């Protein structure tokens, strides 16, 4: 047996896959410097932002007039979005619905409405049907989450509810995130309908008429869609992570506002100007960052690394080796 | 220079960097993106 981490001769044997090494110079591996500490930097915003009244609301809007709300400059918490109901559907595209407590987003959009029971599958990327092309359309590069839950005990009534409407007739399919509130009559025929009902003149709205008696696949469902935008920005909104003091001139691993890395942070001389947040290099990688608690610029440089070679005669003659470190001045090994 | 510039390709994945892929998706799903990136980079280096 041979231990591949005892001495350079053993490493050479382990690389060559042999118990005898002949005369020559062999390239064994590379040497790096490991991190010692760990820091996390997040913005100092501590207030919360509206999530209770988005879900604990009295009346949601119809499908064709879906309610839109913008969420920014807060601290998001998603633990409270667990006990909505005994059973509910929670599907996220582009993110996993367990890791969105340590991610920083630019702007959050919340769209709320109420849908027929069996049409929940139609709120999805690139799906066709009745509401996905005439009421609510989603893009093909969506990055967000969809939540749906039962609303029989609250919405359906015995006396009769007719306050929820959808649209059935339209010229062309809707652009994503586009709303229509027109009531102009349909023109299937060749003659004008002069704003009166008749054949080929249909009013492009319809009612649900929910009653507590229909089958399990027909009761109303409440649907809310969350849209994110994970890009480069001041990062107005993100969740509950505790900050830590920053260190300099030492190889550590860092998490700057959602950007994870390892390296050495140094005071910067770049000529940033107000709107510039971070910088790049020739190879399209991050080089400079701006600390979101002091508004100062730091430069990132990976800590020392290099290549190691072993010079030995044949194992038949001796077991002595010499080590060559490539491209380094060994006053700074 | 072109070998260096190939590092910004996506190869059908959701991002051109690895840390955000590992910090946004669960282990069951990040494997496809990691495989795509690894295969693309291996092909580029082999061609070189």
């Amino acid at each position: 047996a041979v231990d591949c981490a005892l001495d350079p001769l053993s490493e050479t044997k382990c690389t060559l896959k042999s118990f005898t090494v002949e005369k020559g110079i062999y390239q064994t591996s590379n040497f790096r410097v490991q991190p010692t500490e760990s820091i996390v930097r997040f913005p100092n915003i501590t207030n919360l932002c509206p999530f209770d009244e988005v879900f604990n609301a009295t009346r949601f809007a119809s499908v064709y007039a879906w309610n839109r709300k913008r969420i920014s400059n807060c601290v998001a918490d998603y633990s409270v979005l667990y006990n909505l109901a005994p059973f509910f559907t929670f599907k996220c595209y582009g993110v996993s619905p367990t890791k969105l407590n340590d991610l920083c987003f630019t702007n959050v959009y919340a769209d709320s409405f109420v849908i027929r029971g069996d049409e929940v599958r139609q709120i999805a990327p690139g799906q066709t049907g009745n509401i996905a092309d005439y009421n609510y359309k989603l893009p093909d590069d969506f990055t967000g989450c969809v939540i749906a839950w039962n609303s029989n005990k609250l919405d359906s009534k015995v006396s009769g509810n007719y306050n929820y409407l959808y649209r059935l007739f339209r010229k062309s399919n809707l652009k994503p995130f586009e709303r229509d509130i027109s009531t102009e009559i349909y023109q299937a025929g060749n003659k004008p309908c002069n704003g009166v009902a008749g054949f080929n003149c249909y009013f492009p709205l319809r009612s649900y008429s929910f009653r507590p008696t229909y089958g399990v696949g027909h009761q109303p469902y409440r649907v809310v869609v969350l849209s994110f935008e994970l890009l480069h920005a001041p990062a107005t909104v993100c969740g509950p992570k505790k900050s830590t003091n920053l260190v300099k001139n030492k190889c550590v691993n860092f998490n700057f506002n959602g950007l994870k890395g390892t390296g050495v942070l140094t005071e910067s001389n770049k000529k940033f100007l107000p709107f510039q947040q971070f910088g790049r290099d020739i190879a399209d990688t991050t080089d400079a960052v701006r600390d979101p608690q002091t508004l100062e610029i730091l430069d990132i440089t990976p800590c020392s690394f290099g290549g190691v070679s072993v010079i030995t005669p044949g194992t038949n003659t001796s077991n002595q080796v010499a080590v060559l470190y490539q491209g380094v001045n060994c006053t700074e090994v | 220079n072109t070998l260096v510039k190939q590092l910004s390709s996506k190869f059908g994945a959701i991002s051109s960097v690895l840390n955000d892929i590992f910090s946004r998706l669960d282990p069951p799903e990040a494997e496809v993106q990691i495989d795509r990136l690894i295969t693309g980079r291996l092909q580029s280096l082999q061609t070189y």
Binding site: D281, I282, A283, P302, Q326 | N1, L3, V4, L7
Partner: peptide
């Protein structure tokens, strides 16, 4: 020599960026 000097003069940050990706150049 004179001609060798002329020939040597005739033929002539990116290096650091390449090195930080793992590509190095060995000496003769």
């Amino acid at each position: 020599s004179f001609i060798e000097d002329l020939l040597f003069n005739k033929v002539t940050d990116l290096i650091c960026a390449q090195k930080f990706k793992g590509l190095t150049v060995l000496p003769p």
